[PDB]
Design a protein around this ligand. Structure first.
Ligand code: ZN
Lengths: 82, 345, 94
C-alpha cells in the first residue's frame, strides 16, 4: 500500500499535467485561433486550450498533419532463431 | 448528347438595357435616379430589401418608345424567366454599386477582414520577387413586384389554375396560408478553412442538399500536396432567413365536387415572417420546380414536385370624429343593437 | 502514366529566399537565450522559430520528420554541402 500510494500520487501528477491540456468546455464549443509569424501570414487552429498559450497551439499545428515518415524496423529476427 | 438551338433573346443586349435602366430611370410622376438612391441606401446599410417594380420597367420602355427607340421587351423577359434575371439584376447592381457615404463600422463585418487578408494573400503570392463568389458579398435581398393597371402576372390565379407550363414564370396566386413553419436559416455560401495552409474556400449552395469538401483545393495547399483537412465555419458562411408555408385554394375558386389543392411557398431574406396562418393573401412569386438528389431522383424519375419562391406578398384586408358623429346621432344602444344582424326582427 | 512526383526536401528548396538565407537573415534577431528564463522556455523558444520556419518551408512533414529529412539531405546533396562550406568560408574571411 505504501508503493501503491506513491504510484497513485505519480498518476495524479501525470493526470493533472494531462488535464492542463484538456479543454474546460465540451468538444463542440468551437474556438478558432489565427496565429501570425512576424512574416505576415494567417494560420488557423481549432481549440479552446490552444487559444491562450502558444506552445499548445504549435503542438496542434504539428499534430494536425497526417503525413508520417517511414521508420524502418529490424522486424525482431531474434525470434526466428530457436 | 447536348444539342444546341437558337433563341431570339439576347442576354447581352438585355443586360445593357438593365444597366442603362438602373442609371437612367427616374420617377417624376409623384412630385437623380431613384434606384441609384436605393443602391446608395444599400451602400449606407439603410435598407436590406431591393424591390424592382415591373410597372417602372414598362414605363421606362414606354419612355424609350416616346424617345423613338425600341427596347427588347424586358418585362416579358422578366415574366418568362425571372430566375436567371434575378442573378442578372444582382450582377447589374454589383456592377453599379455606389460608394458608402457614412461610417462603415468595419469591426462588425468579418467577411471584409477575411477578403482583406485574401487580397493580401493574392498580392503576396503573385508578387514574384473570381476570388470570391458574388453571393457572399451581397448584403441585399432582391425582390420583384408585378405590373398592375396597365400581363399574366397582373392577372391573379387560383392554385388549381397554376399548371406545368407556369414553371419558371412570375405568377400571382390568391389563397389562405394553412401552415407557416418556424424561421430557419438556409445557407448560400459555405466557408471552409484549411488548418495547414491557412486559406479558405467557398462552396455555393443552390439545392436542398449539398455535400461538404473534405480536402482543400488551394494552390499553396496542393503545391506541397499536404493533405490538410477542411473545417466548416458558420461565422463566415452566408445565411438567409428561409420559411416554408403552405397556401390553400380558396373555396370559391374550387369547382363543384373537387378537393382544394395546396402549394408550397418558400420565402427568403427580408420577406420572412410576413406570412401568417389563416390569412387570405396575394402572393406574386417565381414558380420553380423542386428537384430531388440521389435515390429519390432516380426512383421518381421525371415526376418532380414544385414550389413557389415568393417575391411580393399583398394582404387582402379621424376615428374620434366619427365617434362624435355617432354621439350626435343619438341612441347609440338601439342603433348598435338593431344595426347588428339586420336579417332578424 | 506519370502524373506527378511527390515533393521532397530538395536542393532548390533550401537555396530559395524562404529557407537558409531566411535563417541567416533572422535567426539572430529571433532567437533569444536568457539565463533568467528557465530551460523549458529557452528550449521552446529555440524550437518555435525553427518550427515556424519548417511550416513555412516544408509543411507536409512533421517537425521531427523534418529534422530527419534535413539530416538525410545534408548527408546527400552536394550543393547544400558547398553552400555550408561557403557560409563558413565567408565568415572566416571577414
Ligand atoms: Zn490547404
Amino acid at each position: 500500500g505504501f508503493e501503491l500510494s506513491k504510484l497513485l500520487q505519480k498518476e495524479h501528477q501525470m493526470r493533472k499535467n494531462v488535464i492542463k491540456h484538456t479543454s474546460a468546455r465540451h468538444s463542440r464549443f468551437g474556438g478558432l485561433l489565427s496565429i501570425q509569424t512576424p512574416d505576415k501570414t494567417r494560420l488557423t487552429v481549432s481549440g479552446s486550450q490552444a487559444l491562450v498559450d502558444e506552445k499548445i497551439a504549435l503542438q496542434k499545428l504539428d499534430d494536425s498533419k497526417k503525413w508520417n515518415k517511414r521508420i524502418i524496423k529490424k522486424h525482431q529476427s531474434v525470434a526466428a532463431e530457436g | 448528347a447536348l444539342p444546341s438551338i437558337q433563341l431570339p433573346v439576347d442576354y447581352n443586349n438585355l443586360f445593357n438595357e438593365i444597366t442603362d435602366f438602373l442609371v437612367t430611370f427616374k420617377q417624376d410622376t409623384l412630385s437623380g435616379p431613384k434606384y441609384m438612391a436605393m443602391l446608395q441606401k444599400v451602400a449606407n446599410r439603410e435598407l436590406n430589401s431591393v424591390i424592382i417594380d415591373l410597372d417602372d420597367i414598362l414605363q421606362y420602355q414606354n419612355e424609350k418608345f416616346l424617345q423613338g427607340t425600341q427596347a427588347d421587351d424586358l418585362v416579358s423577359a422578366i415574366q418568362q424567366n425571372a430566375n436567371h434575371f434575378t442573378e442578372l439584376f444582382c450582377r447589374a447592381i454589383d456592377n453599379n454599386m455606389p460608394l458608402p457615404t457614412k461610417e462603415i463600422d468595419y469591426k462588425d463585418d468579418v467577411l471584409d477582414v477575411i477578403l482583406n487578408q485574401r487580397r493580401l494573400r493574392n498580392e503576396r503570392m503573385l508578387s514574384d520577387r473570381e476570388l470570391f463568389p458574388p453571393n457572399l458579398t451581397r448584403r441585399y435581398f432582391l425582390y420583384f413586384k408585378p405590373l398592375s393597371q396597365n400581363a399574366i402576372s397582373s392577372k391573379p390565379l387560383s392554385v388549381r389554375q397554376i399548371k406545368g407550363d407556369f414553371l419558371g414564370q412570375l405568377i400571382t396566386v390568391r389563397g389562405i396560408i394553412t401552415r407557416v413553419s418556424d424561421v430557419k436559416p438556409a445557407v448560400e455560401v459555405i466557408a471552409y478553412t484549411c488548418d495547414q495552409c491557412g486559406y479558405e474556400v467557398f462552396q455555393e449552395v443552390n439545392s436542398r442538399t449539398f455535400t461538404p469538401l473534405s480536402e482543400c483545393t488551394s494552390e499553396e495547399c496542393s503545391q506541397n500536396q499536404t493533405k490538410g483537412q477542411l473545417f466548416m465555419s458558420t461565422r463566415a458562411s452566408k445565411f438567409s432567413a428561409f420559411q416554408e408555408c403552405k397556401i390553400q385554394e380558396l373555396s370559391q375558386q374550387v369547382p363543384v365536387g373537387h378537393i382544394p389543392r395546396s402549394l408550397n411557398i418558400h420565402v427568403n431574406g427580408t420577406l420572412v415572417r410576413s406570412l401568417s396562418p389563416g390569412d387570405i393573401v396575394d402572393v406574386t412569386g417565381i414558380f420553380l420546380p423542386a428537384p430531388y438528389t440521389g435515390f429519390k431522383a432516380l426512383k421518381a424519375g421525371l415526376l418532380t414536385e414544385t414550389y413557389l419562391e415568393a417575391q411580393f406578398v399583398r394582404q387582402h384586408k379621424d376615428v374620434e370624429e366619427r365617434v362624435m358623429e355617432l354621439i350626435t346621432s343619438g341612441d347609440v344602444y338601439n342603433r348598435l343593437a338593431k344595426s347588428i344582424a339586420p336579417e332578424i326582427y | 502514366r506519370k502524373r506527378r512526383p511527390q515533393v521532397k526536401l530538395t536542393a532548390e528548396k533550401l537555396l530559395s529566399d524562404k529557407g537558409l538565407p531566411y535563417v541567416l537573415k533572422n535567426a539572430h534577431k529571433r532567437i533569444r537565450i536568457s539565463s533568467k528564463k528557465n530551460s523549458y522556455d529557452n528550449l521552446s523558444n529555440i524550437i518555435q522559430f525553427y518550427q515556424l520556419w519548417a511550416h513555412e518551408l516544408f509543411p507536409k512533414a512533421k517537425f521531427k520528420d523534418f529534422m530527419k529529412i534535413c539530416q538525410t539531405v545534408g548527408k546527400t546533396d552536394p550543393v547544400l554541402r558547398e553552400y555550408r562550406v561557403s557560409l563558413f568560408r565567408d565568415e572566416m574571411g571577414m
